[PDB]
Amino acid sequence: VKKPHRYRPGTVALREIRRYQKSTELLIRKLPFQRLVREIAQDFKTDLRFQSSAVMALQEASEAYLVALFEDTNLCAIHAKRVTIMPKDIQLARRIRGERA
Amino acid sequence: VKKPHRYRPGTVALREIRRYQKSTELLIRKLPFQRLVREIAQDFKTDLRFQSSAVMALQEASEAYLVALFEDTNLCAIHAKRVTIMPKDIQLARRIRGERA
Amino acid sequence: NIQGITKPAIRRLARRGGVKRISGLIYEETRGVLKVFLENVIRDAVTYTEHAKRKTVTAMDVVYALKRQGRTLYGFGG
Amino acid sequence: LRDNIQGITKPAIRRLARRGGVKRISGLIYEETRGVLKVFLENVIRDAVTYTEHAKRKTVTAMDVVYALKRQGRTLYGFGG
Amino acid sequence: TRKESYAIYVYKVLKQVHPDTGISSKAMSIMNSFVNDVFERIAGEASRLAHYNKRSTITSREIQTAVRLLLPGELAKHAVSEGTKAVTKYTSA
DNA sequence: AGATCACGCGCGATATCAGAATCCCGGTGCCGAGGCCGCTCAATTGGTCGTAGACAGCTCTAGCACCGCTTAAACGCACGTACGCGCTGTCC
Structure with a gap:
């Protein structure tokens, strides 16, 4: 009759994992992250200017840190016999890392 | 016709936890650890002497590191809905810490 | 603001991290974690820029701030 | 020395686990803990002996161990430094 | 020979904080090691700050910034206040 | 057949009979800490000279900002399937 080609759930997830581990471009849009950085900074000092390279460095460091955190989170979830990462996984990863008290 | 007073499993374990978190004395026996330290050092330089203070410092550092590792291990074991720590728990703790590759 | 850090962006970061399935609440937790990390790094960077008596935060300030926290970053004149 | x-007996590892808040310990944990301890001691004593050799000494002093730990990021108080 | 330490100064601080409280030798050594460690941390950060700014001298401003970087929030605030007050007293006298 | 009362069985709570481990109270000897003494080395006082840093002027680079298009990406909605989670039983 007709039927869509819907991939079994979890297949496009693997395709995306392969696609994003093979690339290097930043995964957060530049402008929203720049606005977030400026807002966080304005707490510490008013009328601050940022070098474009400064925001780019912040984005690179943040994305690398988040990717490593998600790697540890995925390991924690797999340790719990699960496949989904859940906030308790992030909390355990951060607690073991020594980041969160 | 009397039965001895057996504590339910897990009671004496908790009593020991309280006792050993209350105290500070070293838990590893001193002579075996000194022999281990000398044997390990024998693979880097022969005919080495050790200040008693040096062996004591090594023992304190090792015991503190192991206690922290066991805390993280217990956290992972509880994360997996378990109460018993297993070697996989130690491996996950070390992997997240960044010690083990 | x-x-x-949109839901798809966190999805992409999780995917690059090797994550197959993501819970619904992971996004808010990740936003909080990113906010904490940025707060620390930007606080150190702004401290460096203030000590230099500058109103502009230079990439070198960010690099030094990251190096302080044990997150050395290469590629920005380290 | 062999x-x-x-x-590092089983009860010693049990005591270390208890100080860590562990209630139940698997049987396989003891060998894994011994391996981990051996790795840690190898990493520390390597640097301690490096410091001793640089000072042209045949005796490993507590300050060498303290320097090694500080190098590894495990600063130790109570033995000088 | 002479082995210098912070024993006497830490004891003076203790007696000014808890006049009826002593300190054991091991605790004395730990406190001395802690003072040395914090000294090294602050001095190293100040040296890095001077180097970054192409500056040859470590002034009180460098020490203040190093303290602000090293210490957490409330500790940093109180340490900065104490340092500035001590420097002001010194300059006056 | 239904309701009430009495007896028996099952479950929960308290007590208890105990006995086990811990904490506490007292006496005791100790050695580790606090303190006083003497000696000396490192810090303070005084002075010089030189360069490092402070300050003003100028330049122009880069940051900010604004606009307008286009279009990749976010947002939203829906179906469903497969994964999380609870319950249960067995074995070690």
């Missing part, structure tokens, strides 16, 4:  | 790693 913190919501500018 | 087979001294087994000198």
